[PDB]
C-alpha cells in the first residue's frame, strides 16, 4: 500500500515518463522531473526519495530504453536524460552504476556538472559519485591507468568534487577528500596530493590539522610498499611549509619516516627556511637527537646563519640534557641517591637467612654485579662505589670480567665528555691487557651519540684499532663503532675498512667490526658493501658456517642496510645467493632488517610463509631464529596496530607449537616488539610462564633476558617480585641462568632511561635506537656472547638509549615549572576531536617529571604556550600574547 | 602457578567513520589473522612427532586401564595409600601407584583413579568443571573506558582497587596499606555498574571471572559450596585474577535461621563464599567485584571492613554526566544541526545512562519513522516521553 | 558404551526437556487481521520484534 495522500507521485512523476515523439512535451517533462528530483534529493533530509523510489522499476525500463532517445537535440535534451538517469544511480542500476556514471555524468557535464548535485548534501553525486570515482576510477586506473580523455576529464571532475567535499558542506567530510585522494588517483596520487595542497592550504588554516592527522595515520599503515607509502609521506610536505605554520618540527618526522631523508628534503624543510630558528626550531634541533649532520650542514661551514651555530649544536648534543637531567635527579626531584648493585640485589629479605654463607666472588656473579652496577647508575656522575676504591673490584673477575667491568664503569658516566675522561684517565694506564681493552670500551662509550668536535674516540683508539691483540681490537673497534653511531664519516670508514678487511683480526673481531661499521652507516656505503661481501666470499666454508660469530658479518651488512627498502637488498640477495646454505640465514637477516618500520603483509608474508612455515619441519638451524626475531622487525611499531596480533601469532603459534631449537626461543622478539611492562601482553604470561618452564636451557636464559626490554624503567614493582620469585626461589642453582637473571631483571633500576627505538612522538622510529639489534642476534646465539662469556660487549652495546624525563624551558633554562598532565593514551586526532593524549590528569606534576609512552603530557591553563606541541622532554614554554 | 587469560583483539575505533582508515586497520587485522591461520595450518600440515617412549607409556596406560574415573583427593595417608572421594561423594581408602608424582598430590587436586579396584593412577590439575569454565571470560567485552561517560570518581576508585595493585603496587607497601581485597558497586539500576565491570574486563591484565551470583546456587546438596570453592580455586590458580559477582544480592541477603534444607544450603553456600573471601590474603592478587542495586538488603558481614573495604556509589547521573553520556551515545548518530540535546538534559528527571541510551535509540527509531536518518530535535523531543513512561503539582513550588 | 565407557558417538547439544517444551513448535492461529484497534500497538511491537531481526542494517 502507498501513501495515498501523496499518491500523485506514483501518478505525475509516473505519467510524465510513461506518457513520455513530441519534442516540446519531452523538454517540458524533463525540466519538471529535474525540478522535482532536485527539490527532493537536495533539501528533503528524508533518505527515502519519493521519485527515486517511484522512478525505479520504471526507470530501469523507461529511462534505460529512453536512454538513447536518438539524441533529439544536440545534447541539451540528452543532458536532461542524463540528469534524470543520474538520479536513480544507487539502487535502480546494477553494480556498474559506475558505468551509469561513465555514460550519464562522465560523458556529459550539465553546465556546472554539480548543478543538480552540489545542491545535494552528500548523496546524489558526492557520496555516490565519490563511490563511483573510487570504484570506476579504481578499476579503470587498474586496467586503463592512462586512458583516453576519459581519464583526464574524470580527473578534473574528481578534483572539483573533492574540493567541494571541503566547501560544499564544510563538514567532517574533511576526512573524506583525503580518503578520496588516497583511493582516487591510485597511480596519480601526487596529482590529488597537490590538488588538496593548493585547495586546503589556501581555503582555511584550521582545516589542515585534520589533513595532517589523516595522512599521518595512513603513513603508519599505508599500502604494502613505499610507492604510495612514500607519496603519503610526501603529502604533508606542502602541508608543513609556509602554506601552514612554518615551525612544525614534524619536518624531522615526515623526513625520518621516508628513509630519514636529510640531504634531499631536510635541506629544504629546515635547512632552507632557517628563519624562525630562534623559536622552537632550536628545540626542533633539540628534539632531533639523531642527525647531527643536519645542523653541521649550515652551522659549521658558514657559522653566519645564526650566532647559536656551534653552541646550539653542543648544547643539544649531550651537555644541557645532562645538566637538566642532573637537576631533575638532585635539584628538582630528589631521586638521586647512592644506588649501587648491592643496595637492591639483596632487596629481598629472603637472602638474609638460609645462605649458610654462599658468598662467592666467582666470575659469573661478580661479572653480573659489575654489569648491574653500571646499568643502574647509567649517566650518573655519582657512582663512586665500585669505581675509585674498587680497583681490586675491577680485578676480581675472569679475563672478560675486566673488559666488561671497565665498559660498565664507562657506562656509568654516560655521554659525559668532562667527567667521563677525567674518570677514565686513571684507568687508561690500567697496566693490564683486559682492563686496558675495557678502558678503550669506556672511552668509546662516553661518545654515545655525543658527536664530539674534538673526536676523542678516534685519536684515543687509533693506536689500538689495528694493534696486534684480539682484546685490544675488540675494545677499540667496538668503542669507535659506538662513537660514530650517527654519521659515517670517511675517516672512520678509511680506518676500519682496513680493519675488517684485515685478515689479522679474528672472525669474532671481524664480526664485531662488521657490527661497528653497520651501525656507523645506515645507508649504502658501497665500500662497506663490497668489503663485507668479499669477506663472505673469501672466508672458508667451515669458518663462514660454524664460527658462532659468522652471524655478525651479515648482521653488520644488514645493520648498514637497515631501513632502506629492498632496492639494495635485491643485488645483496643476488651476490649472497651464490654462498653457502648459511646465506639463507644471511639473507633472511639482511633483507628483513632493511625494514625497521615497514608494516606490510608481503614481507612478513615471506617471513611467515617461506621463512617460517617452509622451515618448521626443516632442521636448518638459526634460519628460523632470525625469522621469528625479525617477525617484529618491520612490525616493531606500526602504531602498535601491527604489534598486538604479532604478540598473538607469536605466543599462540610460535611459542606454543614451535621447534624446540629454531622457534622455542622465539622470545627476544617480544623484547624488540614492545617494551613498557604489560602483564599478559608482553611480560607476565609469555615471559614468566616460559621462564618457570626451565625445561629448555636456552629458552629459559634468553627469556629471563627478554625482560631487559621492559627493564628500561619498568617501575620494577611486579617485575622485581618476579626476580625475587626466581632469585633464591627460582633458577638460583643454575649458574648461567642466575647470571642472566641478575643482569636482566636487575638492570631495571636505571632511572629515566628508555630503550625503545620508536621516538617520543610515536610516529617515527630511530635508526640509532634500532642499533640495539646486535644484542638480539648475539643474545639469541647465547654461545660465547651471553650464556658463555665469549664476548659481553654486545650486552654493553645498549647505548642506543634516551632519557624518559620531561622538562620545559623558555629560551634560557629549565627553570619553568608549569603544570603537566601525564596519563595513558586515548583516542585523538583522526576521530571527531583531538582529545588530549591523557584522558584525565592522573598525576598533576608541575615540576619536570617522568613520561613513559603510556604517559603523555598536555599543557595547562595556557601560560607561555609551546609552539612545539611535541613535548620532546624539552618543551619550550615560549610566551606570546598569552591569555589573549 | 600459570598466568592470566582473557585475550581480546584490537580496539580499532581509532577512526569510526569508515573513511578507509578503518579499512586499512581492519585489513591489517584480517591479513594478520590470515597469517596466523596459514602458519598453524601449515604447521599441522607438517608436524611429525609421536611415539618415542611408547612401550613404557603403553604399559603405564595398561596399568591405568580404561576408563579412569577422576576423584578428589580429600586426604592423604602414609605415602602408599590415600583417601579419595569419588564424584558421587563416597570416599575410599585406596593405594597410590608408583608412577604418580607424589609432589602433586595435595588435598583438593583431582586424581585419576582406576575404574575397578580404585587406586590413584594420575593427577589432574585442570579439572575445571564446565560451570566454572563457562564463568571464565574468553573474549573480552568490546566496551571501554572511553565508552563510559561520567563516573570519573567511580572509574578512579575501581582502578585504584583492581588495576593499581596488579600494575605497580610499590605505593601500597610503601605506605604500609594493604591493597583493597574486594570492592562492591552499588546504586540504582542502569547507572553503570555492569558497564564498569565490562570496561574493567576490557582494560585488564588478569583472569576475569564473570559470575551471576544466582549461578552459584545448585540443586544438589553440596554442589553450591563446591562450585564456589572451585571458582575461587581457579581464581588463585590463574592469579592474578578478578572475580566479578554480579547481582550479589541474589545470595548476599540477610542471614537468618534456616529451617528448610534448601535455605540451609543457601546459607552454607554464602558461608563458604565468605570463608573463601577470608581465605586468600589481601596481598594476594585475586580481587572480587560485586554489584547490586539493593545495597541495604545485603548481609552486614559480607560488607565488613575486614572483608570488603571499598564501596563504590553509583548515583543517578548529574547534568554534566548526562551530557557526557548523551555525547557518547549520539556519537555514532548522524544528528541534524538543529538538535540541541540540552532540553532533555535540563528536564529534571531520573534519566540514567540506560535511559539516555534508550532515548537515543527511540529517537533513531522515530527518525526511521519519517524515512530519514538525520534525526532532528523533534525526534528526541517525542522520544523522551515515548521512553519515559509514568509531588502533586503545586505542593512544592 | 555399556561399561567400557568409550566415546562412540556425538549427540546434539543438551537442552533439558522442561525448556525444550517451551519452543512454539505448533504455531498458534491468530492473525493481525483478528486484532481490532491496536494498529499503533502493532506497529510499535513490530519496530522492536521484526524490524531489528528482518533488517538490522538500518
Amino acid at each position: 500500500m502507498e501513501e495515498g495522500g501523496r499518491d500523485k507521485a506514483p501518478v505525475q512523476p509516473q505519467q510524465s515518463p510513461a506518457a513520455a515523439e513530441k519534442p516540446s512535451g519531452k523538454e517540458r517533462r524533463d525540466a519538471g522531473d529535474k525540478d522535482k528530483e532536485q527539490e527532493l534529493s537536495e533539501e528533503d533530509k528524508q533518505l527515502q526519495d519519493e521519485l527515486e523510489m517511484l522512478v525505479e522499476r520504471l526507470g530501469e525500463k523507461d529511462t534505460s530504453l529512453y536512454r538513447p532517445a536518438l539524441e533529439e537535440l544536440r545534447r541539451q535534451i540528452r543532458s536532461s536524460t542524463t540528469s534524470m538517469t543520474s538520479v536513480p544511480k544507487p539502487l535502480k542500476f546494477l553494480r556498474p552504476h559506475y558505468g551509469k556514471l561513465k555514460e550519464i555524468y562522465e560523458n556529459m557535464a550539465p553546465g556546472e556538472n554539480k548543478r543538480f548535485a552540489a545542491d545535494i548534501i552528500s548523496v546524489l553525486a558526492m557520496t555516490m559519485s565519490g563511490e563511483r570515482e573510487c570504484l570506476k576510477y579504481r578499476l579503470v586506473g587498474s586496467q586503463e591507468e592512462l586512458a583516453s580523455w576519459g581519464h583526464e576529464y574524470v580527473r578534473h571532475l574528481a578534483g572539483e568534487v573533492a574540493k567541494e567535499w571541503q566547501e560544499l558542506d564544510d563538514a567532517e567530510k574533511v576526512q573524506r577528500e583525503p580518503l578520496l585522494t588516497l583511493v582516487k588517483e591510485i597511480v596519480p596520487y601526487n596529482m590529488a596530493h597537490n590538488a588538496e595542497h593548493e585547495a586546503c592550504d589556501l581555503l582555511m588554516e584550521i582545516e589542515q590539522v585534520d589533513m595532517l592527522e589523516k595522512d599521518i595515520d595512513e603513513n603508519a599503515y599505508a599500502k604494502v610498499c613505499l610507492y604510495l607509502t612514500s607519496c603519503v609521506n610526501y603529502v604533508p610536505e606542502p602541508e608543513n611549509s609556509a602554506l601552514l605554520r612554518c615551525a612544525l618540527g614534524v619536518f624531522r618526522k615526515f623526513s625520518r619516516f621516508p628513509e630519514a631523508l636529510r640531504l634531499a628534503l631536510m635541506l629544504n624543510d629546515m635547512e632552507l627556511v632557517e628563519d624562525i630558528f630562534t623559536s622552537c626550531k632550536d628545540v626542533v634541533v633539540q628534539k632531533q637527537m639523531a642527525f647531527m649532520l643536519g645542523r653541521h650542514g649550515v652551522f659549521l661551514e658558514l657559522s653566519e646563519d645564526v650566532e647559536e651555530y656551534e653552541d646550539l649544536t653542543e648544547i643539544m648534543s649531550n651537555v644541557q640534557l645532562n645538566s637538566n637531567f642532573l637537576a631533575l635527579a638532585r635539584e628538582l626531584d630528589i631521586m638521586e641517591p647512592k644506588v649501587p648493585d648491592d643496595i637492591y640485589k639483596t632487596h629481598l629479605e629472603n637472602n638474609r637467612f638460609g645462605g649458610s654463607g654462599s658468598q662467592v666472588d666467582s666470575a659469573r656473579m661478580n661479572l653480573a654485579s659489575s654489569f648491574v652496577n653500571g646499568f643502574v647508575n647509567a649517566a650518573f656522575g655519582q657512582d663512586k662505589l665500585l669505581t675509585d676504591d674498587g680497583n681490586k673490584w675491577l680485578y676480581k673477575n675472569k679475563d672478560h670480567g675486566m673488559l666488561s667491568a671497565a665498559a660498565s664503569l664507562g657506562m656509568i658516566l654516560l655521554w659525559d665528555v668532562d667527567g667521563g675522561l677525567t674518570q677514565i684517565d686513571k684507568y687508561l694506564y690500567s697496566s693490564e691487557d683486559y682492563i686496558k681493552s675495557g678502558a678503550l670500551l669506556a672511552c668509546g662509550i662516553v661518545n654515545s651519540g655525543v658527536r664530539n668536535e674534538c673526536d676523542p674516540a678516534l685519536a684515543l683508539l687509533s693506536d689500538y684499532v689495528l694493534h696486534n691483540s684480539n682484546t685490544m681490537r675488540l675494545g677499540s673497534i667496538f668503542g669507535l663503532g659506538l662513537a660514530y653511531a650517527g654519521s659515517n664519516r670517511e675517516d672512520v670508514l678509511t680506518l676500519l675498512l682496513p680493519v675488517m678487511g684485515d685478515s689479522k683480526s679474528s672472525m669474532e673481531v671481524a664480526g664485531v667490526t662488521a657490527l661497528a661499521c653497520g651501525m656507523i652507516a645506515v645507508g649504502s656505503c658501497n665500500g662497506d658493501v663490497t668489503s663485507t661481501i668479499l669477506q663472505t666470499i673469501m672466508e672458508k666454508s667451515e669458518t663462514e658456517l660454524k664460527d658462532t660469530y659468522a652471524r655478525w658479518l651479515p648482521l653488520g651488512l644488514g645493520l648498514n642496510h637497515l631501513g632502506k627498502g629492498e632496492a639494495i637488498e635485491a643485488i645483496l640477495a643476488a651476490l649472497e645467493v651464490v654462498s653457502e646454505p648459511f646465506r639463507s640465514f644471511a639473507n633472511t637477516l639482511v633483507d628483513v632488517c632493511a625494514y625497521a618500520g615497514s608494516g606490510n603483509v608481503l614481507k612478513v608474508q615471506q617471513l611467515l610463509h617461506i621463512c617460517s612455515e617452509h622451515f618448521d619441519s626443516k632442521e636448518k638451524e638459526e634460519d628460523k631464529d632470525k625469522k621469528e626475531k625479525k617477525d617484529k622487525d618491520k612490525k616493531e611499531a606500526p602504531a602498535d596496530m601491527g604489534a598486538h596480533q604479532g604478540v598473538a601469532v607469536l605466543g599462540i603459534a610460535l611459542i606454543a607449537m614451535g621447534e624446540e631449537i629454531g622457534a622455542e626461543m622465539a622470545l627476544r622478539t617480544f623484547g624488540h616488539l614492545l617494551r613498557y611492562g604489560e602483564p599478559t601482553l608482553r611480560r607476565a604470561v609469555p615471559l614468566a610462564l616460559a621462564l618457570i618452564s626451565v625445561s629448555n636451557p636456552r629458552l629459559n636464559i634468553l627469556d629471563t633476558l627478554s625482560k631487559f626490554s621492559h627493564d628500561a624503567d619498568p617501575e620494577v614493582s611486579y617485575n622485581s617480585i618476579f626476580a625475587m620469585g626466581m632469585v633464591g626461589s627460582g633458577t638460583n642453582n643454575a649458574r648461567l641462568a642466575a647470571m642472566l637473571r641478575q643482569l636482566a631483571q636487575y638492570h631495571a633500576k636505571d632511572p629515566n632511561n628508555l630503550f625503545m627505538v620508536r621516538l617520543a612522538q610515536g610516529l617515527t622510529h630511530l635508526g640509532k635506537g634500532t642499533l640495539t639489534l646486535c644484542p638480539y642476534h648475539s643474545d639469541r646465539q647465547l654461545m660465547s656472547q651471553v650464556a658463555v662469556a665469549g664476548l659481553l660487549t654486545v650486552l654493553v652495546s645498549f647505548l642506543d638509549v634516551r632519557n624518559i624525563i620531561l622538562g620545559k624551558s623558555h629560551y634560557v633554562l629549565y627553570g619553568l615549572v608549569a603544570a603537566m598532565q601525564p596519563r595513558m593514551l586515548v583516542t585523538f586526532d583522526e576521530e571527531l576531536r583531538p582529545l588530549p593524549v591523557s584522558v584525565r590528569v592522573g598525576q598533576a606534576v608541575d615540576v619536570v617529571g617522568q613520561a613513559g609512552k603510556p604517559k603523555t603530557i598536555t599543557g595547562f591553563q595556557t601560560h607561555t604556550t609551546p609552539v612545539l606541541l611535541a613535548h620532546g622532554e624539552r618543551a619550550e614554554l615560549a610566551t606570546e600574547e598569552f591569555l589573549p | 602457578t600459570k598466568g592470566p587469560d582473557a585475550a581480546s583483539k584490537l580496539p580499532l575505533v581509532t577512526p569510526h567513520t569508515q573513511c578507509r582508515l578503518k579499512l586499512l586497520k581492519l585489513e591489517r587485522i584480517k591479513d594478520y589473522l590470515l597469517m596466523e591461520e596459514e602458519f598453524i595450518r601449515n604447521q599441522e600440515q607438517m608436524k611429525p612427532l609421536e611415539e618415542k617412549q611408547e612401550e613404557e607409556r603403553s604399559k603405564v596406560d595398561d596399568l591405568r586401564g580404561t576408563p579412569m574415573s577422576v576423584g578428589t583427593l580429600e586426604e592423604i595417608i602414609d605415602d602408599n595409600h590415600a583417601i579419595v572421594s569419588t564424584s558421587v561423594g563416597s570416599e575410599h581408602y585406596v593405594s597410590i601407584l608408583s608412577f604418580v608424582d607424589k609432589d602433586l598430590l595435595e588435598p583438593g587436586c583431582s586424581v585419576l583413579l582406576n575404574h575397578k579396584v580404585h587406586a590413584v593412577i594420575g593427577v589432574l590439575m585442570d579439572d575445571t568443571d564446565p560451570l566454572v569454565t563457562v564463568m571464565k571470560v574468553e573474549k573480552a567485552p568490546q566496551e571501554t573506558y572511553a565508552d563510559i561517560g561520567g563516573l570519573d570518581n567511580q572509574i578512579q576508585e575501581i582502578k585504584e582497587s583492581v588495576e593499581l595493585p596488579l600494575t605497580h603496587p610499590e605505593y601500597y607497601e610503601e605506605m604500609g596499606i594493604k591493597p583493597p581485597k574486594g570492592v562492591i558497586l552499588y546504586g540504582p539500576p542502569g547507572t553503570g555498574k555492569t558497564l564498569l565491570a565490562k570496561a574493567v574486563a576490557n582494560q585488564t591484565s588478569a583472569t576475569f571471572l564473570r559470575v551471576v551470583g544466582s549461578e552459584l546456587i545448585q540443586k544438589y546438596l553440596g554442589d553450591g559450596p563446591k562450585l564456589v570453592r572451585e571458582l575461587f580455586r581457579v581464581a588463585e590458580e590463574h592469579a592474578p585474577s578478578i572475580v566479578f559477582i554480579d547481582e550479589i544480592d541474589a545470595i548476599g541477603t540477610k542471614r537468618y535461621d534456616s529451617n528448610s534444607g534448601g535455605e540451609r544450603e543457601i546459607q552454607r553456600t554464602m558461608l563458604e563464599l565468605l570463608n573463601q573471601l577470608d581465605g586468600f590474603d589481601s596481598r594476594g592478587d585475586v580481587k572480587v567485584i560485586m554489584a547490586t542495586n539493593r545495597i541495604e538488603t545485603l548481609d552486614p558481614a559480607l560488607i565488613r571492613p575486614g572483608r570488603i573495604d571499598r564501596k563504590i556509589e553509583f548515583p543517578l547521573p548529574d547534568e554534566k554526566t548526562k551530557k557526557r553520556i548523551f555525547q557518547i551515545h549520539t556519537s555514532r548518530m548522524t544528528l541534524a544541526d538543529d538538535v540541541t540535546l540540552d532540553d532533555l538534559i535540563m528536564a529534571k528527571d531520573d534519566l540514567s545512562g540506560a535511559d539516555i541510551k534508550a532515548i537515543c535509540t527511540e529517537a533513531g527509531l522515530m527518525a526511521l519513522r519519517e524515512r530519514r536518518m538525520k534525526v532532528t530535535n523533534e525526534d528526541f523531543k517525542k522520544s523522551k516521553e515515548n521512553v519515559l513512561y509514568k509531588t502533586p503539582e503545586g505542593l512544592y513550588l | 558404551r555399556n561399561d567400557s565407557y568409550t566415546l562412540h558417538k556425538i549427540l546434539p547439544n543438551k537442552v533439558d526437556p522442561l525448556v525444550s517444551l517451551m519452543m512454539v513448535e505448533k504455531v498458534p492461529d491468530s492473525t493481525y487481521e483478528m486484532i481490532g484497534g491496536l494498529d499503533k500497538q502493532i506497529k510499535e511491537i513490530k519496530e522492536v520484534i521484526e524490524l531489528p531481526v528482518k533488517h538490522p542494517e538500518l
Binding site: - | 567513520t17 569508515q18 578507509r20 578503518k22 579499512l23 585489513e27 548522524t334 | -
Partner: peptide
C-alpha cells in the same frame, strides 16, 4: 498519524543512498 511500515523498496533505499561508500568492504572485512 498512521505511520507506514517501511516497504521493500524503502528497506532497499535505506540500505543504500545514505551509506558510506566503504560500508560494504568494512562490513565484509569485519
Amino acid at each position: 498519524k498512521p505511520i507506514r511500515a517501511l516497504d521493500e523498496g524503502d528497506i532497499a533505499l535505506l540500505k543504500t543512498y545514505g551509506q558510506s561508500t566503504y560500508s560494504r568492504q568494512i562490513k565484509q572485512v569485519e
